[PDB]
Structure 1
């Protein structure tokens, strides 16, 4: 996901190709540097538009040499293209013209080939610049989304801090970890925004910002799941804090984080080593099992509360269960819709809305967290949610 390319031309077949999605009226800059010239050069560049996104996704450089001829023979795909070629005696390195600008916003495939006629000799610098300095399309909406999420989490943290300050006299231990979750979200969104700003204004992504961000996301989700499990079991809320009730159970249930650590990082550093897609299923199955456990535990706790005729906590648990069930239903609907809208079409004819699959989950999590926070608002009578032996 870069925007600048440095390449030693005397390497392999010398073909340099890239498939991306660009804005409209975006220029491409080519520069050459190196040692003096003693031989003849031939340059040939092709720029092809895309009709539907599939070709970009499955574009393999290994067969470029064939793909080019596949475009010449007309058994490729529709879409107008611009081709050009030039000759240089020895170097003519101080060259101007190398028209070559985008005419319509859509997926693009760019290919450049160099033929030498008579060891590293030259070095090619390739840049792409649109209306924004280096922020190519497919990232602008994502950057806006991350900025908005940063603002929303800042507001959430401010509200939580104000509420805690206004009722600092007495607080609940379970009520403290909300602050930790908010802090983790703050760090995650800040890292996203900083990385995106750096990429836009420099053209190169951070060395390891994505890995740290994925680790933070996994940690936050694991903490949320463990807190939900503990609240559902009623540990410290309905039943007393028994010696070994979460011991070996709740903590032993944190291995979910590990499975999250083998998915987000992988997804980020896509390697496609036959394990990229496979890591997705087991995590979903584990989450389904966790929900299966949670609902049963929550039903048992509701029965126990009904037995002893407790009123205040009964309504709170009813609201909690309603919110959780609605969240689960919404998540299932969203997953089914994404699966039936993105991975069923012959080829994706709607390339605009592919960033939604990586943003909807965060928005849903933020909404659920906000609802949960609203449920547990600190107040003067902040002791009803205690065991009270």
Structure 2
């Protein structure tokens, strides 16, 4: 989120806040360039290692002075703080070579892997002073500008990009031998795989912008989450279509196919906008509002899938189609395992994310934005195992009916 804070020092506000999770031996450069003046400048900076997760991210910029008044007499805050209040007589003297050196720690090189907070207050003694010195706050760790909050997601997306690359190679290796036996579901699954390709490719490019150039582009994040929303929407659309048995039950569903794609479009029009809200860091009211129709939609759509699945299971039980019955029985078992794993992951992660008074284990929050993608990737792998090409796949996949 723009770790190189290019904030020009204004007259409207005098307090800058920077609260993240940082590597040990991370340095915080401050770059000061501006039109030199003659004003007395008192720069006070604070670097505090808040041991708890809550006192930095639930912390808001409104209570910066309240956090200061808590820290001065040690109310409600735990950890060690480091500070200096070096004074500058003239504005020009700030521009001159004043390479920062840390003074003394009271119980700017970082001392541990922890969530830190960084507060700068600039005492002035107006319109020109508004946005005069472009203060560039540059955080620089051992692995360049990347932070622990964003660190394991990057290597995780390395790994899962490798996973989909292997998936695409395997899919093409399967499709190379046989082409005349391919039906529309094969092209649709290939499309889902390629959507995963493009989505995780642009998202990885976004993290590459984060680590090398150190800048955040919101449009790439919009594109990535929009692609993911379209991808999972089309995936569950395929699940619903298969659960109704296209061709096996009815050659063309028609108006019910229109209602299926309308259900998919409604799911998009809610959940994709929800994901776009997650991109921009939606406020607490919008965040609380967003997931109610989302959760209701997941419950309703999944229940409809189970109803359709049991119904087509009964019909195929009447049909006495042996190998198809075995394959779709494995499909139902996969769906049961997927739903159970997903719901237990939801309960564990979401409940223990907020019920506990202090998230004291900061290291394992990269799983939260990763477990859904891991589950869905495993689901895609199982589906590709079930739908592997073969010589008798012409009779195995579909029968004239």
The 1:52–1:301 alpha-carbon spacing in structure 2 relative to 1, beyond 3 Å, is: same
Structure 1 Cα separation of the partners of residues 222 and 142 of structure 2: 29
Runs of 4+ in 1 over 3 A off after TM superposition: 92-98, 117-121, 242-245, 249-254, 385-389
How far off is 1:222 after superposition? Answer: 0.5
Contact 1:233 1:301 in 2 (8 A): yes
List gaps (5 residues or longer) in structure 2: 99-107
Which sits farther off after the overlay, 117-126 or 47-56? 117-126
CA distance in 2: counterparts of 1:138 and 1:196, whole angstroms = 12
Inter-CA distance 118–5: structure 2 relative to 1 (3 Å threshold): closer
Indicate the residue corresponding to 1:298 in structure 2: 309
Q: 2:233, 2:264 within 8 Å by CA — same for their partners in 1?
A: no
Q: CA deviation at 1:283?
A: 1.2
CA–CA distance in structure 2, aligned partners of residues 135 and 253 of structure 1: 37
Residue 33 of structure 1, CA deviation: 1.1
The answer on whether the counterparts of 1:46 and 1:110 sit within 8 Å (CA) in structure 2 is yes
Conserved? CA contact 2:324–2:397, under 8 Å: no
User: Displacement of 1:242 after TM fit?
Assistant: 4.5
- Which piece of structure 1 moves more, 369-378 or 86-95? 86-95
Task: Report the CA distance between 1:23 and its aligned residue.
Answer: 0.4
| Conserved 8 A contact 1:237-1:385 | no
How far does residue 76 in structure 1 lie from its aligned partner after superposition? Answer: 3.2
TM-score by length of structure 2 reads 0.92
Summarize deviations over 1:18-67 as a string: whole Å, max 9, x none.
11110001111112111122122111111111111011121111121232
Q: Tell whether 2:287 aligns with 1:287.
A: no
Q: CA RMSD in A?
A: 2.0
1:85 counterpart residue number: 85
Report the Cα distance in structure 2 between the residues aligned to 1:121 and 1:172, rounded to whole angstroms: 64
Q: What's the offset of the Cα at 1:95?
A: 6.0
List per-residue Cα deviations over 1:154-187 (Å, max 9, x = no partner).
1101111111111123211122101000000001
Report how far residue 386 of structure 1 moved. Answer: 5.4
Query: 2-side partners of 1:118 and 1:191: how far apart?
Result: 40
Q: 1:130 Cα deviation (Å)? A: 0.8
Structure 1 pair 357/31, CA: closer, same or farther in 2 (3 Å)? same
Moved more, 73-82 or 88-97: 88-97
Deviations 1:69-105 (A, max 9, x none): 221122131111011111122135466775x211111
TM-score (ref. length: structure 1) = 0.95
Q: What are the within-5 Å matches in structure 2 for residues 351-370 of structure 1?
A: 351-370=362-381
Larger helix share, 1 or 2: 2
Deviations 1:83-137 (A, max 9, x none): 1111122135466775x21111111110111112994433212111110221111
- Looking at structure 2, the residues matched to 119 and 134 of structure 1 have their Cα atoms a distance apart, in angstroms, of 28
Is this contact kept in 2: 1:312–1:384, CA < 8 A? no
Aligned-pair CA distance for 1:278:
1.9
CA distance 1:120–1:324, change in 2 (3 Å): closer
Structure 1 range deviating more: 87-96 or 198-207: 87-96
Count of residues paired in the alignment: 388
2:101 is matched with none
Report the Cα offset of residue 10 of structure 1: 2.9
SS at match of 1:347: coil
Select between 341-350 and 233-242 the one with higher mean Cα deviation: 233-242
Q: Is the 8 A contact 2:45 2:84 kept in 1?
A: yes
Contact 1:238 1:387 survives alignment (8 Å): no
When structure 1 is superposed on structure 2, of 144-153 and 85-94 the one drifting more is 85-94
Separation in 2, partners of 1:359, 1:205: 20
